Scaffold this active site. Structure first.
Site, PDB file in Angstrom:
ATOM      1  N   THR A  10       0.871  -1.261  -0.083  1.00  0.00           N
ATOM      2  CA  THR A  10      -0.075  -0.015  -0.130  1.00  0.00           C
ATOM      3  C   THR A  10       0.838   1.336  -0.056  1.00  0.00           C
ATOM      4  O   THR A  10       1.818   1.250   0.510  1.00  0.00           O
ATOM      5  CB  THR A  10      -0.888   0.074   1.215  1.00  0.00           C
ATOM      6  OG1 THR A  10      -1.750  -1.178   1.345  1.00  0.00           O
ATOM      7  CG2 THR A  10      -2.044   1.139   1.090  1.00  0.00           C
TER       8      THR A  10
ATOM      9  N   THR B 277      -2.564  -0.096  -3.895  1.00  0.00           N
ATOM     10  CA  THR B 277      -1.704  -1.048  -3.442  1.00  0.00           C
ATOM     11  C   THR B 277      -1.509  -2.419  -4.481  1.00  0.00           C
ATOM     12  O   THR B 277      -2.399  -2.675  -5.271  1.00  0.00           O
ATOM     13  CB  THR B 277      -2.081  -1.708  -2.265  1.00  0.00           C
ATOM     14  OG1 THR B 277      -1.196  -2.700  -1.477  1.00  0.00           O
ATOM     15  CG2 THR B 277      -3.514  -2.414  -2.297  1.00  0.00           C
TER      16      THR B 277
ATOM     17  N   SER C 171      -8.534  -3.285   4.380  1.00  0.00           N
ATOM     18  CA  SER C 171      -8.588  -2.074   5.420  1.00  0.00           C
ATOM     19  C   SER C 171      -8.079  -0.783   5.108  1.00  0.00           C
ATOM     20  O   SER C 171      -7.962   0.184   5.897  1.00  0.00           O
ATOM     21  CB  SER C 171      -7.192  -2.733   6.485  1.00  0.00           C
ATOM     22  OG  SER C 171      -7.634  -3.933   7.072  1.00  0.00           O
TER      23      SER C 171
ATOM     24  N   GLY D 171      -0.423   0.143   5.814  1.00  0.00           N
ATOM     25  CA  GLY D 171      -0.424  -0.473   6.915  1.00  0.00           C
ATOM     26  C   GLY D 171      -1.077  -1.766   7.362  1.00  0.00           C
ATOM     27  O   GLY D 171      -1.181  -2.409   8.292  1.00  0.00           O
ATOM     28  N   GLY D 172      -1.740  -2.275   6.214  1.00  0.00           N
ATOM     29  CA  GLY D 172      -2.475  -3.344   6.237  1.00  0.00           C
ATOM     30  C   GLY D 172      -3.955  -3.208   7.426  1.00  0.00           C
ATOM     31  O   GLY D 172      -4.450  -2.149   7.420  1.00  0.00           O
TER      32      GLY D 172
END
Ligand SMILES: N=NCC(=O)CC[C@H](N)C(=O)O
Lengths: 335, 194
Positions: free
Chosen positions: B1, B19, B73, B93-94
């Protein structure tokens, strides 16, 4: 009308290109499209045309949301990453052609531009083309990610044939990507989903045993959606709805924190109590996330119930400000 | 991302998170075209109760199906006040993305920190599973009194081995603009005078 424009970009190249567009009279969408293609060259660890994403917009006083997330190929199946013992196959969903969803980025940038852009499409790709042809300077962190990826791929892909020469502070050129970007500038997403680039992607899939076919690419569409709206303390937050979990999460995080305001009074940022309180809230958010959330066209996701103020108050009542809640007693809230 | 944020002189705003999923995606390059393919499929639940690369689990709602978008997310965000943009922000950052945005929002609106400080401040993460585990990064690790006190409560503290986001943000104060690029990354911000 403001004192100017502004950009905050993840590297110096996206920042420069965005500023050049705004100065040339582009609007924020024009700038965003040029920046997104630029980072597909200079930030290839994440910037992309072979991936997907989300765009939240505020244009002429109204909010918008564009979903250009990848979709599972038509041949994907529930159990496609399990072995003959019913086990998840290590890294099959992470490394190699079967890990790929149908890319959405080129379609997403096109739809944003078609709806809101003021400048010509081909002009918005010239900066990215320039960085692909004459190069950009590789960054320290970028190189470190390159080294880790090589390790994870474990010589199972062609990654090294294209990105093995990235060296920090040394110029990196991408001639094939330059030509691809030129086709997209001239033909539009037609090239990527129906033309020469589509054909090269399908040939890669056939060589590597991937699942993406011509029918998959022709059927891809980005989707406009109503953005998630969250109000608190007189501010209005617009953020990603499903298939992002983040809009529901932020609605619950903010709403629960507001319900527990008394517990946050006099509490310093990143004190033990602060971090404990956030952790208690995140427990309930992630319980709901795992149980309920997914592509909203594929199940009836109870979004209204999970963001209802009375539901927020019930979940806030579970927060224990003095001790950790028993993890095995934290339930999805509609159970 | 990665994420970027843009405001133009008309008050229009774009917040864009996109991403390949993991860094460099699947590692497969389309020969002759030069671009990498994502490994976004790992964001589906491959098997109920089994965690993916970011430690998050799922069941039927996020199971793999043809044509389905995998749960994300990513949370590109725009805050407004009085019908005008006031803050544009987002981050990689997932599963840490929306908790990092949450913290930055608290830093700006509850603790009233300058945008640069709100973005530079330590950020931590908990996500129910792994049980009672709080993640930190090496940029601002949990240490000292606060770490001892959280451990005394029963938390496990773990360095997740990659920085806890990379916030790219713009704040509008009336007609004036300022930018903040996360010190965890190599971002750059600019105000662009017409
Ligand atoms: C980055 O952080 C990847 C984000 C992840 N694949 C997601 O969609 O939540």
């Amino acid at each position: 009308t403001l004192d100017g424009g502004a950009v905050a970009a993840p590297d110096q190249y996206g920042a420069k290109v965005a500023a050049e567009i705004l100065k040339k009279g582009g609007n924020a969408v024009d700038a965003a499209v040029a920046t997104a293609f630029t980072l597909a060259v200079t930030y290839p660890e994440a910037g992309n045309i072979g991936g997907g994403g989300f765009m939240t917009l505020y244009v002429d006083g109204k909010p918008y949301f564009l979903d250009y997330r990848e979709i599972a190929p038509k041949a994907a199946t529930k159990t496609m990453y399990l072995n003959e013992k019913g086990e998840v196959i290590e890294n099959l969903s992470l490394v190699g052609a079967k890990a790929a969803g149908v890319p959405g980025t080129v379609m997403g940038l096109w739809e944003a531009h078609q709806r809101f852009g003021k400048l010509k499409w081909s002009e918005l790709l010239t900066p990215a083309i320039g960085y692909a042809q004459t190069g950009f300077k590789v960054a320290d962190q970028q190189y470190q990610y390159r080294q880790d990826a090589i390790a994870l791929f474990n010589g199972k892909t062609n990654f090294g044939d294209y990105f093995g020469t990235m060296k920090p502070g040394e110029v990196f050129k991408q001639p094939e990507l330059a030509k691809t970007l030129e086709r997209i500038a001239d033909k539009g997403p037609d090239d990527f989903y129906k033309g020469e680039t589509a054909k090269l992607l399908i040939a890669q899939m056939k060589q590597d045993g991937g699942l993406i076919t011509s029918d998959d690419l022709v059927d891809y569409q980005a989707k406009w959606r109503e953005p998630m709206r969250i109000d608190w303390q007189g501010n209005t937050l617009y953020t990603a709805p499903l298939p992002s979990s983040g809009g529901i999460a932020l609605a619950q995080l903010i709403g629960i924190k507001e319900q527990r305001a008394a517990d946050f009074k006099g509490v310093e940022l990143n004190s033990a109590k602060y971090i404990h309180l956030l952790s208690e809230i995140e427990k309930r958010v992630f319980a709901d996330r795992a149980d309920y959330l997914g592509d909203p066209q594929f199940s009836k996701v109870p979004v209204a119930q999970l963001t209802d103020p009375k539901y927020i108050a019930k979940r806030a009542g579970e927060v224990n400000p003095d001790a950790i809640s028993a993890t095995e007693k934290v339930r999805p809230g509609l159970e | 991302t990665t994420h970027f944020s843009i405001v133009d002189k008309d008050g229009n705003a774009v917040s864009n998170t996109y991403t390949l999923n993991w860094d460099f995606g699947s590692g497969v390059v389309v020969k002759g075209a030069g671009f990498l393919l994502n490994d976004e499929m790992d964001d589906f639940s491959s098997k109920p109760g089994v965690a993916n690369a970011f430690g998050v689990v799922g069941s039927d709602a996020n199971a793999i199906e043809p044509g389905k978008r995998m749960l994300s997310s990513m949370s590109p965000s725009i805050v407004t006040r009085d019908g005008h943009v006031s803050l544009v922000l987002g981050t990689p950052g997932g599963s840490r993305i929306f908790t990092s945005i949450f913290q930055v929002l608290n830093n700006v609106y509850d603790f009233h920190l300058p945008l640069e400080k709100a973005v530079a401040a330590q950020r931590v993460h908990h996500q129910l599973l792994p049980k009672d585990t709080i993640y930190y990064d090496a940029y601002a690790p949990l240490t000292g009194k606060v770490a001892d006190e959280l451990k005394a409560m029963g938390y496990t503290l773990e360095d997740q081995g990659w920085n806890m986001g990379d916030i790219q943000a713009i704040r509008v104060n009336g007609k004036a603009l300022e930018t903040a690029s996360d010190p965890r990354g190599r971002g750059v911000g600019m105000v662009v005078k017409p």
